[PDB]
C-alpha cells in the first residue's frame, strides 16, 4: 500500500478498492466510483439475469465513473444543454454493471443511513454518472452514505420472451436488486447502516422503486422509499407478457432474426448492440409520447401480478414512503412528437392540433375516451384560446402518465397501512434552458434534492441554495426516521402525512411549506375511476 | 255603471271590475271565454273559437281551472297549496284574463301574455302569484293570461288520428294569442308589441311558439323562465305518446284510433286523472305523462333539430334560471328527501337518486353523472351529496337545456339576455336547504312584494320594482336596460363568445361569464355521445 490516503482503501466481498477524495463546497468527501457488482452481462449473458461479480485480485481503482449501459442517444436538439445533461457522459458498453458510493471524509464513526438512487430515463436510458446525480453534496452536508448503480436499459435490460430460459424479462430490475444485495453485504465497510436503507428514484427510477416495494425478494433489502414523478402502476411502466412477447419478436424480425425462443434469442445475441438500439423505437404499437418499447413485464415472477392488482391488495403496514410530482410533468414530452410544439417558440396551438395531440398523448384511448379527455380539459369559456390549449395538452400528458398514477398510488398505500408523505415541487430553476412555457419540467427537481445549487460555480441564486439545503434535510430526515420533519425545529410549518380522509400534501418552493388538500382530486377521478369504465 | 269597465270585443260586450292595487286602481276583465267549451265530443280536439254572445258578459271573477291532478303530498301546507287550483275544476276552462291601467291607456301599450307552468299536467291563470294588477298599475302594462288544457285533456295524443292529434293545449294557447291580436286594442293594448312570458312548462310552451311558424305572427318577443322546448321532459316522440295513450286507455277499460278515443270520451274526467301517473316508463322525477308531442305538424321536428337549424334573426329573447332548480323535485320521489328535515343523504342514496333523476340513463351514463358531481375531497359528506343530487336534477332538466337554447339562439341571429335569480324570498315556507326553488322568482316579477299585507321586506319591494322594470323594458324595446339610467352596470346580451349573463338578487346587477359551462359541456356534448 504505502503512501496513499488511508481513508481511501477499503475492502468489500470481492476485493480491495481505492477511492478518491473529492472536493465539495463545505469540505472533502470520499467516493468509490465504478465498483463492479455483477459479471459483465455480455455474449451469452445478454438478456440474462445478472450473476454476482467474481472476486478480483489487487486493489481495484475506483476513482472514475465506469461505462454507461448501451442506449439510444437523444439528438432532437444536439448541442443544447437541456437535452445533453441527460445524455451518456461515459463510453457506452454492455459491460456496465458498476455502482458508486459517496461517504463523508473521514468515514463516519457510527453506522449511517444509506440512500440508494435509481435513475430514470423511461427504462431505455440513463446512467448513475450524470452530473445531476452527484452524491457529494448529500454526503458532505448531511453525512449520508449515497449509493447509485447502473442497470441495463432498453432491449438489454427489458427485452423479454416470457416463459423462456434465455430472455425471462425484468433483468434490469434484477441488476438493481443485485446492487441492493451488494449494499446489504458491503455498505458497512464504508460506514453505512444496512438496517437503514432508503431507495429513491425519479421517473422510471421511481417506478423501479415501486416495483421493489411490490416484489417480495426486494423487500428485505430496504426499509423506506421515495418515488419522485413516477410509479409502478399507470400506462407506461409495465407491459403484459403478451405485449412484451410481441415487441421482442417484432424487434427480432427487424434485425434479421426469424420457430422457438432459444433459436430467436441466440440470433439476437449475435447482433451488435447498436443494431438493437437502431430498431428499438420501431416496435411501439402506435404514434405516441411517454411510451417506451422495453419496460418491466408482468411475468408472474418479479411481478406476481399487475402493479394495479398488487397496490389494491397489498399489505403495506410497515412501510414509509415519500412521493410527489413537479408542477409541469407533461410539458417536455410534447416537443418529442406532438405537432405544433417546439422548445424554440411559444407553442401556441389550435384546437385541431389539441385533438391530434390527445390521440398521441393518450394512444391507448378509443374515440369516445379521447373525446372525453378533450371535453374535460377544454375551457368552455375560451375553447379556442391557443395558450389554454397548449397548457391543457401539457396537463393531459402530465396527469395521465404521472400525477394521477401518483395520486392513485398514495391513496392505496395510505388506505392499506403505509405512512405516506406527498409533495408538489413548484420551483423553476433560475438556470433552466428550456422555455418558460414548459414551467417546471419532469426531472428538474432532482438537481435541488442532490444539492447542486451549493456549488457556487453553477450560478444558482442564494435563495435556491437555501431551498436546496431545505430539501436535502427533508429527504435525509425521511431516510433517517421515516418522517421528513425536523423534531427539534417545532415552529417550522409541519408536513402532515397523506391520508384518504384529508388528502394532504405540501408545496415545495422558495416560500415556507404550505399544506394543500386533494391532489388534482376531481381530474384524477376522471382518469382513475371514470376512464377505466370506458374500456368495458 | 263605469264606462272604463265596459268593453266591446268581437264576440260582444264585457263588464270588468275595478281592483285595488297599492298605488291605485286597475281594470280587470277576468274569465273571458276564448274558445267553445272543449267538452263531450270536443275532448282531445283542437279548440274552436268562442261563438258570439248576447248582452253584457260578466267578467269580474276568475273562471274554472282546467281539470287536473291536485297535489296532496303536504296537505294544508302553503308551499304546495299556493300551486293547487283555487277555483272549481272543469273541462269547461278555456277563459283568459286581462289587466289594464285605470283609466285605460290613451295610446297603445305593450302587451305581456303569461303562460303558466305545472309540467303540462297542472296550473291555472288564477293563482295569486300570477296576479297581473301590479304590472298593470305600476308599469302601465296590459297583461293577459289564459287557461289551457293540461294532462290527458291537453296532451293525450294518438298521432296521425283525427280525434286526438296531440298538442291541443298548445293550440289553446295559440288561440288565446289570436284572440289578443283581434281584440286587445279595445283594452288599449298594442297588438304590434306582444311579449310572451312563462315559467317551467309555460316557458317550454313559449319556446314551442318560437319553433312553430303559425304562432310566430302572434307575438314579437319572448321570455323563458326556468324552462325550454328542448331537453328531456318537454316533448315526447309520436311513438312514446301513442304508447302512453293506449296504456292509459287500457287502465280505464278501453276499448283502431276512432273506437279507442270514443271510449275515452265517455269516461268521467277524474277517471282519466286517476291513472295519468301510471303510464310513465320508469320511476322518475321531473317527468310528466302527457306533454307536447313531436307530431310533424305543430312541431315539424324535435325541438333539438329546430333550434339547431332555425333562423332567429328578428327575435329578442330573455332567458334564465333560479339558483336551485332541482331542489324541490327531490321530495316528490327521491328516498331520503323531505321538507321537514335537512335531508342529509348517504352515498348509496345519491346513486339511487341519480337513477331516478336521470331515468333515461344507462348504467355507464349514471356512473359518469355520479363521478362528475361527487366532490372527491369529501366523497361521503352528506351535505355535499344532498346539494349534488339537487344540482343533477336542476342541471339536467333546466340549467343545461337553457344554456343550450341561449347558445343556439345567439349563434343564429337572436338578441338574447340571460340571468340567474338568486334571491330567496323572506316569506318562503320550504326549508333552507332547498335554497331558491323552481317557481320562486315569479312572485317578484309579478310585483307581489309591493302589497304591504304580504309582509315582504322593504329591500324585497325595491328588488321587485327593479325586476318589473327589466321585464317591461324588455317588452317595450327588446332590451331590459332602462333607457333613462345612464349609470352602469348594463345587462349585456348573451353571446356564444363572451357568454355573459347577470345575477338578479338584492345587490346591483353583476355580470358573470359562462352559465355552468364545464358542467353543461358534460350534459350537452358528452352524455349524448354515450348512446
Ligand atoms: N431515432 C428515432 C426513431 C423513432 C422514434 C424516436 C427516435 C423517438 C425519440 C426517442 C428519444 C429521443 C428523441 C426521439 N421517439 C420518441 C420517444 C418519445 C418519448 C421519450 C421522450 C423522452 C426523451 N427523453 C430523453 C431523456 N431526457 C430526459 C430525462 C428526464 N427529464 C428530461 C427533461 C427534459 C428533456 C429531457 C429529459 C428525467 C428522467 C430522465 C431523463 N426521455 N423521454 C419515437 C416515438 C414513437 N412513438 C415512435 C418512434 C420514435
Ligand atoms: N298519486 C300518485 C300516483 C303515482 C305517481 C304520483 C302520484 C306522483 C306524484 C305526482 C304529483 C304529486 C305527488 C306525487 N309521481 C311523481 C311525479 C314527479 C313529478 C311531479 C313533481 C312536481 C310536483 N309539482 C306540484 C306543482 N307545484 C309546483 C310548481 C312550481 N314550483 C313549485 C315549487 C315548490 C313546490 C311545488 C311547486 C312551478 C311551476 C308550477 C308548479 N310540480 N312538479 C309519480 C312518479 C312516477 N315515476 C310514477 C308514479 C307517480
Ligand atoms: C413552433 O415551431 C414548430 C416546429 O418548428 C411549428 O410547427 C409551429 O407551428 C410553431 N408555432 C408557432 C405558432 O409559431
Ligand atoms: C456562471 O457565471 C460565471 C461568472 O460570470 C460565468 O462566466 C460562467 O460561465 C457561468 N457558468 C455556468 C454554469 O453557466
CA distance B241 to B161: 12
On the question of a cis peptide bond just before residue B415, with omega within 30 degrees of 0, the verdict is no
Which residues, 6+ apart, have CB-to-CB distance to A456 below 8 Å? A25
Q: Considering only CA atoms, which residue is closest to atom 5 of ligand 4?
A: A459
CA distance A230 to A206: 5
User: Mind spelling out the 3-state secondary structure of B296-330?
Assistant: CCCCCCCHHHHHHHCCCCCCEEEEEEECECCCHHH
Write down how long chain A is: 536
B224: alpha, beta or left? (left if phi > 0; alpha if psi -120 to 50): beta
Contact B322, B443 (CB under 8 A): no
**Using a 6 Å cutoff on CB, does residue A262 contact ligand 4?**
no
Query: In the sheet where A9-12 sits, what is the strand order?
Result: A9-12, A15-18, A59-61
Kindly determine whether residue A375 and residue B525, on different chains, have CB atoms separated by under 8 Å.
yes
Which residues, 6+ apart, have CB-to-CB distance to A378 below 8 Å? A392, B521
Mutate to test the pocket of ligand 1, among A443, A444, A445, A449 (most ligand atoms within 8 A of CB): A443
Q: In 3D, which of A275, A344, A405, A462 has the Cα closest to residue A82? A: A344
Which residues, 6+ apart, have CB-to-CB distance to B344 below 8 Å? B382, B383, B385, B386
List the single residue in A with minimal CA-CA distance to B526: A372
Which residue among the candidates A129, A148, A196, A203 is catalytic per the annotation?
A: A203
Q: Considering only CA atoms, which residue is closest to atom 2 of ligand 3?
A: A342
**Using a 6 Å cutoff on CB, does residue A85 contact ligand 4?**
no
Mutate to test the pocket of ligand 4, among A459, A460, A461, A465 (most ligand atoms within 8 A of CB): A459
Q: Which residues of A482-492 are buried (b: 16+ CB within 10 A; e: fewer)?
A: bbbbeeeeeee
CA distance A431 to A46: 40
Q: In 3D, which of B370, B410, B407, B409 has the Cα closest to residue B392? A: B370
What domains are defined for chain B?
A: 1-531 (3.40.50.1820)
CA distance A273 to A213: 31
Q: What's the A425 CA to ligand 3 centre distance in angstroms?
A: 29
Quick one: which H or E segment has residue A479? helix A462-481
Contact B292, B193 (CB under 8 A): no
Strand partners, A389: none
Kindly determine whether residue A368 and residue B522, on different chains, have CB atoms separated by under 8 Å.
no
User: CB distance from B250 to chain A under 8 Å?
Assistant: no
Q: Report long-range pairs for A274-279 (Cβ below 8 Å, ≥24 apart).
A: A274/A70, A276/A70, A276/A154, A276/A155, A276/A156, A276/A159, A276/A251, A277/A70, A277/A71, A277/A72, A277/A154, A277/A155, A279/A251, A279/A254, A279/A255
Contact A173, A179 (CB under 8 A): no
Contact B29, B59 (CB under 8 A): yes
Q: Considering only CA atoms, which residue is closest to atom 9 of ligand 2?
A: B332
Which residue among the candidates A208, A331, A442, A445 is catalytic per the annotation?
A: A442
CA distance B49 to B35: 4
Query: Count of CB atoms within 10 A of residue B28's CB?
Result: 24
CA distance B327 to B434: 5
Q: DSSP code of A321?
A: E
Q: DSSP code of B28?
A: E
Which residues, 6+ apart, have CB-to-CB distance to A25 below 8 Å? A137, A140, A454, A455, A456
CA distance B287 to B274: 17
- Go through chain A and list every residue after which a break occurs, taking a C to next N gap over 2.5 angstroms, comma-separated: 258
Smallest CA–CA distance, residue B525 to chain A, in Å, is: 8
**Using a 6 Å cutoff on CB, does residue A332 contact ligand 1?**
yes
Q: DSSP code of A530?
A: I
Resolution in A: 2.5
Pairing of strands A15-18, A9-12: antiparallel
Q: In 3D, which of B48, B128, B127 has the Cα closest to residue B94? A: B48
Contact B154, B169 (CB under 8 A): yes
Residue A60 is placed in which grid cell?
A: 481495484
CA distance A310 to A353: 37
Pocket of ligand 2 (CB under 6 A): B 71, 73, 79-80, 83, 117-119, 122-123, 199-200, 277, 280, 283-285, 328-329, 332-333, 437-439
List the single residue in A with minimal CA-CA distance to B521: A375
* Cα B80 to the center of its chain, rounded Å: 17
Kindly determine whether residue B517 and residue A371, on different chains, have CB atoms separated by under 8 Å.
no
Strands (E), B38-105: 56-58, 65-66, 89-90, 95-101
Phi, psi (5° rounding) for residue B341?
-140, 180
- Tell me which chain B residues have a C-beta less than 8 angstroms from the C-beta of A518: 376-377
Write down how long chain B is: 531
Q: Which atom of ligand 4 is the closest one to the Cα of A458?
A: 13
Q: DSSP code of A196?
A: E
CA distance B462 to B472: 16
Strand partners, B46: none
List the single residue in A with minimal CA-CA distance to B378: A501
Contact B501, B320 (CB under 8 A): yes
- Tell me which chain A residues have a C-beta less than 8 angstroms from the C-beta of B517: 380-381
Which residues, 6+ apart, have CB-to-CB distance to A270 below 8 Å? none
CA distance A527 to A506: 22
Q: In 3D, which of A181, A201, A188 has the Cα closest to residue A120? A: A201
CA distance A175 to B402: 62
List the single residue in A with minimal CA-CA distance to B369: A530
User: Mind spelling out the 3-state secondary structure of B340-373?
Assistant: CCCCCCCHHHHHHHHHHHCCCCCHHHHHHHHHHH
Residue B170 is placed in which grid cell?
A: 298548445
Residue B29 is placed in which grid cell?
A: 276583465
CA distance B373 to A527: 15
Contact A313, A362 (CB under 8 A): no
CA distance A204 to A294: 12
Q: Which residues of B are the active-site residues?
A: 200, 325, 438
User: CB distance from B499 to chain A under 8 Å?
Assistant: yes
Kindly determine whether residue B514 and residue A378, on different chains, have CB atoms separated by under 8 Å.
no
Q: In 3D, which of A496, A513, A319, A526 has the Cα closest to residue A408? A: A526
**Using a 6 Å cutoff on CB, does residue A120 contact ligand 1?**
yes
Mutate to test the pocket of ligand 1, among A237, A401, A425, A442 (most ligand atoms within 8 A of CB): A442
- Tell me which chain A residues have a C-beta less than 8 angstroms from the C-beta of B530: 368
Q: Considering only CA atoms, which residue is closest to atom 9 of ligand 3?
A: A340
Mutate to test the pocket of ligand 3, among A342, A344, A357, A384 (most ligand atoms within 8 A of CB): A342
Longest CA span, chain B? 72
Q: Could you say which of B376, B514, B529 has the minimum Cβ distance to residue A371? A: B529
Contact B399, B520 (CB under 8 A): yes
Kindly determine whether residue B368 and residue A526, on different chains, have CB atoms separated by under 8 Å.
no
The SS3 assignment for B376 reads coil
User: CB distance from B526 to chain A under 8 Å?
Assistant: yes
On the question of a cis peptide bond just before residue B87, with omega within 30 degrees of 0, the verdict is no
Kindly determine whether residue A533 and residue B377, on different chains, have CB atoms separated by under 8 Å.
no
Kindly determine whether residue A503 and residue B377, on different chains, have CB atoms separated by under 8 Å.
yes
CA distance B291 to B237: 10
Method by which the model was determined: X-ray
User: CB distance from A371 to chain B under 8 Å?
Assistant: yes
Contact B316, B415 (CB under 8 A): yes
CA distance B330 to B312: 36
DSSP B235-265: -B-HHHHHHHHHHHHHHTT---HHHHHHHHH
- The angle formed by the CA atoms of residues A333, A334 and A338, to the nearest 5 degrees, is 130
Smallest CA–CA distance, residue B376 to chain A, in Å, is: 6
User: CB distance from A524 to chain B under 8 Å?
Assistant: yes
Interface test with B, best of A367, A380, A521, A523 (most B CBs within 10 A): A380
- Tell me which chain A residues have a C-beta less than 8 angstroms from the C-beta of B368: 530
CA distance A201 to A230: 8
B134: alpha, beta or left? (left if phi > 0; alpha if psi -120 to 50): alpha
Q: What's the A393 CA to ligand 2 centre distance in angstroms?
A: 46
Q: CA neighbours within 13 Å on the CB side: how many for B94?
A: 30
Residue with cell 296531440: B166
Contact B46, B165 (CB under 8 A): yes
Which residue among the candidates A94, A142, A280, A329 is catalytic per the annotation?
A: A329
User: CB distance from A517 to chain B under 8 Å?
Assistant: yes
Residue with cell 356512473: B367
Quick one: which H or E segment has residue A395? helix A386-398
**Helices marked H in B124-192 — which ranges?**
133-139, 151-155, 168-183
Handedness of CA A286, A290, A294, A297 (dihedral sign): negative
Kindly determine whether residue A368 and residue B529, on different chains, have CB atoms separated by under 8 Å.
yes
Q: In 3D, which of B321, B96, B119, B317 has the Cα closest to residue B204? A: B119
Which residues, 6+ apart, have CB-to-CB distance to A153 below 8 Å? A69, A70, A71, A121, A123, A124, A125, A126, A172, A294
User: CB distance from B364 to chain A under 8 Å?
Assistant: yes
Q: In 3D, which of A458, A425, A520 has the Cα closest to residue A137? A: A458
Amino acid at each position: 500500500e504505502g503512501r496513499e490516503d488511508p481513508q481511501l482503501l477499503v475492502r468489500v466481498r470481492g476485493g480491495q478498492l481505492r477511492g478518491i477524495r473529492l472536493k465539495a463546497p463545505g469540505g472533502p468527501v470520499s467516493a468509490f466510483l465504478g465498483i463492479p457488482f455483477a459479471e459483465p452481462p455480455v455474449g451469452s449473458r445478454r438478456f440474462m439475469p445478472p450473476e454476482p461479480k467474481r472476486p478480483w485480485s489487487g486493489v481495484l481503482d475506483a476513482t472514475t465513473f465506469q461505462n454507461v449501459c448501451y442506449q439510444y442517444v437523444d439528438t432532437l436538439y444536439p448541442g443544447f444543454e437541456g437535452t445533453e445533461m441527460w445524455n451518456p457522459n461515459r463510453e457506452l458498453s454492455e459491460d456496465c454493471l458498476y455502482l458508486n458510493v459517496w461517504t463523508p471524509y473521514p468515514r463516519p464513526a457510527s453506522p449511517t443511513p444509506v440512500l440508494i438512487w435509481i435513475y430514470g430515463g423511461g427504462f431505455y436510458s440513463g446512467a448513475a454518472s450524470l452530473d445531476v446525480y452527484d452524491g457529494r453534496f448529500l454526503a458532505q452536508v448531511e453525512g449520508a452514505v449515497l449509493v447509485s448503480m447502473n442497470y441495463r436499459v432498453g432491449t438489454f435490460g427489458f427485452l423479454a420472451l416470457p416463459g423462456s430460459r434465455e430472455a425471462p424479462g425484468n433483468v434490469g430490475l434484477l441488476d438493481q436488486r443485485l446492487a441492493l444485495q451488494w449494499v446489504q453485504e458491503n455498505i458497512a465497510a464504508f460506514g453505512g447502516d444496512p438496517m437503514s436503507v432508503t431507495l429513491f428514484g425519479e421517473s422510471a427510477g421511481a417506478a423501479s422503486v415501486g416495483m421493489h416495494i411490490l416484489s417480495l425478494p426486494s423487500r428485505s433489502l430496504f426499509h423506506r422509499a421515495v418515488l419522485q414523478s413516477g410509479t409502478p402502476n399507470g400506462p407506461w411502466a409495465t407491459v403484459s407478457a403478451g405485449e412484451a412477447r410481441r415487441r421482442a419478436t417484432l424487434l427480432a424480425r427487424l434485425v434479421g432474426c426469424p420457430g422457438n425462443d432459444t433459436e430467436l434469442i441466440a440470433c439476437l445475441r449475435t447482433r451488435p448492440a447498436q443494431d438493437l438500439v437502431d430498431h428499438e423505437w420501431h416496435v411501439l404499437p402506435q404514434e405516441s409520447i411517454f411510451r417506451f418499447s422495453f419496460v418491466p413485464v408482468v411475468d408472474g415472477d418479479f411481478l406476481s401480478d399487475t402493479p394495479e392488482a398488487l397496490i389494491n391488495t397489498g399489505d403495506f403496514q410497515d412501510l414509509q414512503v415519500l412521493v410527489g410530482v413537479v408542477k409541469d410533468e407533461g410539458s417536455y414530452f410534447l416537443v418529442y412528437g406532438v405537432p405544433g410544439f417546439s422548445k424554440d417558440n411559444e407553442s401556441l396551438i389550435s384546437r385541431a392540433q389539441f385533438l391530434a395531440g390527445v390521440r398521441i398523448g393518450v394512444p391507448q384511448a378509443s374515440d369516445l375516451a379521447a373525446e372525453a379527455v378533450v371535453l374535460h380539459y377544454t375551457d368552455w369559456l375560451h375553447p379556442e384560446d391557443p395558450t389554454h390549449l397548449r397548457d391543457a395538452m401539457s396537463a393531459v400528458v402530465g396527469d395521465h402518465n404521472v400525477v394521477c398514477p401518483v395520486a392513485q398510488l398514495a391513496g392505496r398505500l395510505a388506505a392499506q397501512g403505509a405512512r405516506v408523505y406527498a409533495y408538489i415541487f413548484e420551483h423553476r430553476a433560475s438556470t433552466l434552458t428550456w422555455p418558460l412555457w414548459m414551467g417546471v419540467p419532469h426531472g428538474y427537481e432532482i438537481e435541488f434534492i442532490f444539492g447542486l445549487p451549493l456549488d457556487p460555480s453553477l450560478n444558482y441564486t442564494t435563495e435556491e441554495r437555501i431551498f436546496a439545503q431545505r430539501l436535502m434535510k427533508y429527504w435525509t430526515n425521511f431516510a433517517r426516521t421515516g418522517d421528513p420533519n425536523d423534531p427539534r425545529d417545532s415552529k417550522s410549518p409541519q408536513w402532515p402525512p397523506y391520508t384518504t380522509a384529508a388528502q394532504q400534501y405540501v408545496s415545495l418552493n422558495l416560500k415556507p411549506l404550505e399544506v394543500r388538500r386533494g391532489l388534482r382530486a376531481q381530474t384524477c377521478a376522471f382518469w382513475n375511476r371514470f376512464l377505466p369504465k370506458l374500456l368495458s
